[PDB]
Nucleic acid binder design. Structure first.
Ligand SMILES: [Mg+2]
Ligand SMILES: [Mg+2]
Ligand SMILES: [Mg+2]
Ligand SMILES: [Mg+2]
Ligand SMILES: [Mg+2]
Ligand SMILES: [Mg+2]
Ligand SMILES: [Mg+2]
Ligand SMILES: [Mg+2]
Ligand SMILES: [Mg+2]
Ligand SMILES: [Mg+2]
Ligand SMILES: [Mg+2]
Ligand SMILES: [Mg+2]
Ligand SMILES: [Mg+2]
Ligand SMILES: [Mg+2]
Ligand SMILES: [Mg+2]
Ligand SMILES: [Mg+2]
Ligand SMILES: [Mg+2]
Ligand SMILES: [Mg+2]
Ligand SMILES: [Mg+2]
Ligand SMILES: [Mg+2]
Ligand SMILES: [Mg+2]
Ligand SMILES: [Mg+2]
Ligand SMILES: [Mg+2]
Ligand SMILES: [Mg+2]
Ligand SMILES: [Mg+2]
Ligand SMILES: [Mg+2]
Ligand SMILES: [Mg+2]
Ligand SMILES: [Mg+2]
Ligand SMILES: [Mg+2]
Ligand SMILES: [Mg+2]
Ligand SMILES: [Mg+2]
Ligand SMILES: [Mg+2]
Ligand SMILES: [Mg+2]
Ligand SMILES: [Mg+2]
Lengths: 187, 233, 216
RNA sequence: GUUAUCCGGAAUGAUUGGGCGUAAAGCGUCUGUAGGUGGCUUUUUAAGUCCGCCGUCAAAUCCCAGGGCUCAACCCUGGACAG
RNA sequence: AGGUGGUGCAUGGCUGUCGUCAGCUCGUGCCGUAAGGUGUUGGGUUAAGUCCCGCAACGAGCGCAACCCUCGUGUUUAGUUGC
């Protein structure tokens, strides 16, 4: 057994102080953050209006990995940042097809937001509205049809889109589930 | 690899019984077996398969070099856990469990920093140069920090295997490990839902004997796995 | 509410004076007047001669100690690369003017320039820095965060920065402040360096107050 | 560019495609005539339904394939899914 | 140049006030689709979010208290202009 002071100062030197070490590590994560929405929410106190910013932000690699996140702070920058982290720990993967599109047609429901996605022919681009379109674009889906029915709220539509593309079943897996060869379901 | 289990020893230590039929969760109805005098009786042929798979993954995870926690907060299970963890040379929680031990790491670890400074203080003998209020206060810090950080105070980094006693009372452990991507190997009585753990072993709650039986089996798996990770690295 | 200039709060405990002399109650007014005249001169000279050569000149403070024979001026200064490198070194060139101002009867003057090691552990220098950047129509967020950085890599335990006025030239004035680390203002044992500074913009005045806590 | 007219967006009259505890919305409650739907098994019939073949649903327009005005718009030939 | 001419709803500095009232918040986590919540609430106790127990919260910051001056008791030292 080596002394307690040198080994605990080794776990103290290995976990670095937050006041002596500045932060930008994020581009080494291989991710890009896109700010969807910036709103000023308010808590009210006996003094007056206590102002905050809420940022809804999605992150993707444009390579088939995407996530949504929501954050709150006093400054635009900080909320952006929190949103970034909350998203990064919430992240999932969208099933893709050789042509960069969806396996099939799907609906989704989150709150009052309903979302309609359907696959497209290559060269149609991504046609959709703000939340759905940023989510899908950041996932890297190249050709997709989508329409949000029901409500318009950015956040809910994002989450609904995630619910959509999460339940998407790729053909290999339905072949495996049903217990039937691919070529038989192809027909 | 094999482990030590038979119908006779599990019959001995009293694993097969659990809480009254007013108190049960029907979510467990698939693998329960009988009901006697309004006292439920849980299937042991499932119990052996789960305990086998549990000691197997415990052996593979010990052998690869992964780190272990064990948890129960009860009165008897605490006296059993300090010794289970000393016998397997692992990390433990017996006394009051703090919310955020796993999930919120950063603040837990700074709490460990200051507890380490306190451990150096107390052995240095520099608590004798202080006013009486200062020594009583530093002794509050010590009492608390020993209660909560007592068994984890070796561990640096995030624990990737957690073992638990009686998930009914242990809810936050289950939540935190569900959240962080950690496996739970847990004891189930007739009142608890088999959602909350990765490998959930049908077991007994009220009995110190069942706790000792299954925990000694598991700490023996961690011990032989400890021989295999003393060898492989 | 109002706080006290944390300078003034600790006087004769954790903080020294600047003018170190003594005088009989009649002469006190005169002597004070003299200190004011040379502080004025020495600030003006350095301002004009350094800001012509385009640099950031910290004048951290001016300590004046009057002795019956020689009156000595010690300039705490953050970067005397601007004052020393010029051919007529600040020592002599100021000595002549500062000795023109007070008097030479029974009093001769000595100038001594001191290098303050960490320029960003001093509020006054830092506030001149933020004054420069905000005079450059850099947004105040950037300026604040740059100051915070420079200072916390310059060895500081705590800092509070306040900026008040018409910010970004917007019509309605406001107050923006950031606290960083730990800054007790009520603890007299704590060593606290405070500084107040004023800036002239296209949109009018801007105040800067800075608190620096160096420990107990 | 502005104004007018119409469809869109509008899932805002909703078959595909909405609702009705508190947001607009369940008759005060039953009995019951027309009307609509209606359990299982075997047979029959073939009205719907389904498949094949024929007649026709004019030419012009729309869709596909060529041809002609230098190109295009426009014109011309041939052919067809729907229904 | 000079302006004690205009505008304190264009501003800095400085101050009053609620009130020397005990509050105000933040970081990480967790609960909520979200604004937000929790921590800061419950049982006690304080002049005090003072402090202790309990609690999905764990910590920190500015406040409070303390470190400052003056008046209370003693001891060592220094004795003129005071004794
Ligand atoms: Mg709905
Ligand atoms: Mg719409
Ligand atoms: Mg204030
Ligand atoms: Mg026109
Ligand atoms: Mg319509
Ligand atoms: Mg309408
Ligand atoms: Mg409606
Ligand atoms: Mg109403
Ligand atoms: Mg109504
Ligand atoms: Mg009714
Ligand atoms: Mg009614
Ligand atoms: Mg009626
Ligand atoms: Mg009827
Ligand atoms: Mg009838
Ligand atoms: Mg009929
Ligand atoms: Mg029928
Ligand atoms: Mg025709
Ligand atoms: Mg053509
Ligand atoms: Mg042609
Ligand atoms: Mg034709
Ligand atoms: Mg036909
Ligand atoms: Mg003028
Ligand atoms: Mg007014
Ligand atoms: Mg929070
Ligand atoms: Mg949430
Ligand atoms: Mg509490
Ligand atoms: Mg409060
Ligand atoms: Mg609150
Ligand atoms: Mg509450
Ligand atoms: Mg009470
Ligand atoms: Mg009070
Ligand atoms: Mg609570
Ligand atoms: Mg306090
Ligand atoms: Mg006295």
């Amino acid at each position: 057994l080596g002394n307690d002071v040198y080994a605990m100062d080794s776990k103290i030197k290995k976990a670095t102080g937050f006041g002596s070490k500045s932060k930008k590590e994020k581009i080494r994560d291989g991710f890009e953050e896109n700010v969807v929405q910036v709103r000023r929410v308010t808590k009210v106190v006996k003094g007056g209006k206590h102002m905050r910013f809420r940022a809804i932000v999605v992150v993707g690699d444009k390579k088939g990995q995407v996530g949504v996140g929501v954050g709150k702070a006093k400054e635009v920058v900080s909320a952006v940042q929190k949103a970034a982290v909350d998203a990064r720990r919430n992240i999932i993967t969208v099933p893709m097809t050789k042509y960069l599109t969806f396996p099939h047609r799907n609906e989704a429901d989150y709150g009052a937001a309903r979302v309609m996605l359907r696959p497209a022919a290559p060269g149609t681009g991504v046609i959709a509205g703000g939340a759905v379109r940023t989510v899908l674009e950041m996932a890297g889906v190249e050709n997709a049809l989508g329409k949000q029915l029901g409500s318009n709220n950015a956040l809910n539509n994002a989450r609904a889109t995630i619910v959509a593309v999460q339940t998407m079943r790729q053909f290999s897996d339905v072949a495996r589930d049903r217990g039937i060869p691919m070529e038989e379901l192809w027909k | 690899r094999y482990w030590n289990i038979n119908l006779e020893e599990m019959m001995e230590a009293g694993v097969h019984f659990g809480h009254g039929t007013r108190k049960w969760n029907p979510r467990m109805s698939p693998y329960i077996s009988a009901k006697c005098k309004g006292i439920h009786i849980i299937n042991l042929t499932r119990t052996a398969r789960f305990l086998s798979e549990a000691c197997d993954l415990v052996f593979d995870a010990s052998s690869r070099g992964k780190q272990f926690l064990i948890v129960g907060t009860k009165n008897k299970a605490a006296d059993s856990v300090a010794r289970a963890a000393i016998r397997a040379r692992c990390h433990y929680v017996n006394k009051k469990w703090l919310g955020g031990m796993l999930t919120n790491w950063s603040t837990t670890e700074t709490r460990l920093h200051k507890f380490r400074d306190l451990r150096m203080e107390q052995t240095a003998g520099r608590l004798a140069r202080l006013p009486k209020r200062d020594a009583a206060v530093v002794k509050r810090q010590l009492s608390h920090l020993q209660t909560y950080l007592g068994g984890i105070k070796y561990m640096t980094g995030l624990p990737d295997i957690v073992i638990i006693v009686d998930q009914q009372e242990e809810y936050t452990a289950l939540r935190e490990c569900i959240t962080l991507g950690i496996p739970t190997i847990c004891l189930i009585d007739t009142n608890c839902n088999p959602d909350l753990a990765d490998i959930s072993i049908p077991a007994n709650d009220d009995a110190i004997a069942s706790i000792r039986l299954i925990l000694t089996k598991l700490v023996f798996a961690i011990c032989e796995g400890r021989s295999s990770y003393i060898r492989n690295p | 509410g109002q706080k006290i200039n944390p300078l003034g709060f600790r006087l004769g405990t954790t903080q020294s004076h600047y003018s170190l002399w003594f005088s009989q109650p009649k002469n006190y007014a005169e002597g004070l007047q003299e200190d004011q005249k040379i502080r004025d001169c020495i600030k003006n000279y350095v301002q004009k001669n350094t800001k012509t050569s385009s640099g950031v000149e910290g004048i951290a403070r001016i300590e004046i100690q009057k002795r019956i024979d020689l009156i000595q001026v010690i300039i705490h200064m953050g970067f005397p690369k601007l004052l020393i490198e010029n051919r007529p070194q600040g020592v002599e060139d100021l000595k002549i003017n500062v000795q023109k101002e007070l008097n030479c009867v029974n009093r001769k003057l000595n100038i001594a320039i001191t290098r303050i090691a960490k320029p960003y552990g001093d509020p006054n220098i830092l506030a001149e820095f933020i004054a420069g950047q905000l005079k450059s129509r850099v947004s105040f967020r950037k300026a604040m965060k740059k100051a915070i950085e420079l200072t916390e890599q310059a060895d500081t335990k705590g800092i509070q920065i306040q900026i008040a006025g018409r910010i970004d030239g917007k019509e309605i004035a406001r107050i923006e402040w950031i606290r960083e680390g730990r800054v007790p203002l009520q603890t007299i044992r704590a060593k606290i360096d405070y500084c107040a500074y004023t800036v002239r913009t296209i949109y009018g005045v801007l105040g800067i107050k800075i608190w620096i806590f160096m420990g107990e």
